[PDB]
Paper text:
Protective antigen (PA), the binding component of this AB toxin, forms an oligomeric pore that translocates lethal factor (LF) or edema factor, the active components of the toxin, into the cell. As the endosome acidifies, PAprepore undergoes a conformational change to a pore (PApore). This pore inserts into the endosomal membrane to form a channel. Three clamp sites aid in peptide translocation: the α clamp, the Φ clamp, and the charge clamp.
To prevent aggregation and migration of the nanodiscs to the air–water interface, we plunge froze the grids within 30 s of sample application. Using our TITaNS methodology, we obtained a 3.3 Å reconstruction of LFN translocating through PApore. Our reconstruction shows a loss of LFN density in the canonical binding site above the PApore. Notably, our reconstruction does not show density for residues 50–135 in the canonical folded LFN position. However, density for residues 136–250 are apparent. In addition to a loss of LFN density in the canonical binding site above the PApore, our reconstruction shows added density inside the pore lumen indicating a translocating complex. We attribute this density to unfolded LFN interacting with the benzyl rings of the PApore Φ clamp as LFN is translocating through the pore. In addition, the density for each of the PApore F427 residues was smeared in plane with the benzyl ring suggesting rotameric states moving up and down. Notably, density located at the PApore charge clamp is consistent with an α helix and suggests the deprotonated state of LF favors helix formation within the pore. Further down the pore we observe density for helix α1 emerging from the channel exit. Interestingly, the receptor binding domain did show different conformations for each protomer and indicates a degree of conformational flexibility.
Numbering used by the authors:
A (entry chain A): 277 to 480
B (entry chain G): 277 to 735
Write the structure that this text describes.
Amino acid sequence: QSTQNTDSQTRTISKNTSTSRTHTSEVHGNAEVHASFFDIGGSVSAGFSNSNSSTVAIDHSLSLAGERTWAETMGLNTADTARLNANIRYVNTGTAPIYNVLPTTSLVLGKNQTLATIKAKENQLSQILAPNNYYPSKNLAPIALNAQDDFSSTPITMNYNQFLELEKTKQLRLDTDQVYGNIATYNFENGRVRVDTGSNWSEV
Amino acid sequence: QSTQNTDSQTRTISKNTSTSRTHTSEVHGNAEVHASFFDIGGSVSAGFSNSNSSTVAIDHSLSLAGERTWAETMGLNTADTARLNANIRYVNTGTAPIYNVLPTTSLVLGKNQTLATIKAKENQLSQILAPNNYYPSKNLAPIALNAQDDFSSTPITMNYNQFLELEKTKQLRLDTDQVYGNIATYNFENGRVRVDTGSNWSEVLPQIQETTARIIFNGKDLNLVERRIAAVNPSDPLETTKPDMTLKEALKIAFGFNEPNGNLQYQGKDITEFDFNFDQQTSQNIKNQLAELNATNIYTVLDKIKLNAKMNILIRDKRFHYDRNNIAVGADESVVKEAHREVINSSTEGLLLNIDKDIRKILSGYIVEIEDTEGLKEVINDRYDMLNISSLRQDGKTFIDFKKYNDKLPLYISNPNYKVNVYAVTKENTIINPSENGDTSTNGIKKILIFSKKGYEIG
């Protein structure tokens, strides 16, 4: 949205001049009946008047125009109406811990109208998820997911009709499709439990 | 935003011409009555006038229009209203150093409204974080985090409603979710300690947490010091291969404690002036061990307390009361003034006296009043914000500057007899609230009374 304010002061200085030439004819008539005690008369008259005028004129003028303009504009794109951001936590109810946790989740509207399918990026990585624990911990606030893309440079987009349906129905559900994560194994060499980045729980 | 200035000069040269043709009719009437001494007349008249005109005209015209236009425009996008930038430092309170430090942090609004979660990028890398150190060092300025893309080419974004809520509430908190970082190991080949980029402390820290007892202690300058000591889990056969750990041996090796006269001591202070705290599992196990040992005082049997894995032992100082976060804050009325009495010479501008470094951290500020012989309250400078009157010294004589508010000049002794009182406020008494109503009469709060001397005695 944008607002525009505009002021405008206009000084208009105007000149005018004029001439005019009039030519007037005229034909008059008259009749008359006079009456007295003993004197009665009558009279008939007619008149022929020509005339000719010429009017020469000139004008000067000023004008001071002050204007204040208020304007407001709201642009929109129907394909990119809304951007999303999820606040989510990770829960381990299992028995073994899982390392380098990257869940694959899904934003879904309605019955089964899937908005988007997003794999967890490097901002969303969980190094350790021990069992009976949360990532992040319960005292802390949940994490934010707002980028479908890999290098995470694109927000999660919603078009117009889905935006209207979301603000009407308020039904936006989240599915956990699959979870990536590695095993750390014991080393008999030095006792140190080390992560194999190659193996994952998907195999197991 | 953009501003536009515009000038416009317009020359309008205009022509006009005209004709007109008028056709006029007219019907006149008249009556007349004349009267004289002996002559009376009357007359009736009527007139029929036609007429016809034709007016031919022409006009020329100029116009000079000068215009100056000012314009201003402010564009905005509601999804990308604000960009953020954090100034942050890295602190190592641990014991081993960590290499190639990349913390994963989180910008959070409100209660739990998370703005963003950002992993530290290559601009934000810390090569070394030795314990008891900062990255960067304390003399230098903290580092700037302002990026989201793993390639640092996109700034962190805030929309409109969050921007309004931030400028209203000013509540923007920062969470440290997890920290990436590597171990450097010793090489027996050439002695050179080398970084394994493959291994990280993520592999190691839960192994330490699940096998040790944790003890937190704050007797060294009221600072929470955490140490984990390996202790036996009986249900794990490999874990039972360790030698047994009594509590007293653990406190000796972990905190530098000693028995210089057969009595366990931290520095010159007895262990009996420290109190113990346990979570429910550890407290239950200590209860069971004391039930088996048939003893009551734990302080007598510290050489017999068998420790186990996953224990948690908080050891604090009884004299100073603490908060929810176990930060030092302010002791009992039997502690404050019980020992803050020094024999020193009174003076103007301020009070040169030596306050113990531990004790001073529990005081938020001081209140300076003057008492009449009969007894009258004329506080020298009131309000919470001007409360702080303490300073730092180069030889150990922590000042209380009484010449802070009197026009950058000294205290007003109206009479030599006039008593000069200086009091202090425990962090649990005077609060963080600064000038809520601007009134804030310092009289209405818990004040202890440490220094009280006569002005004439001052000389």
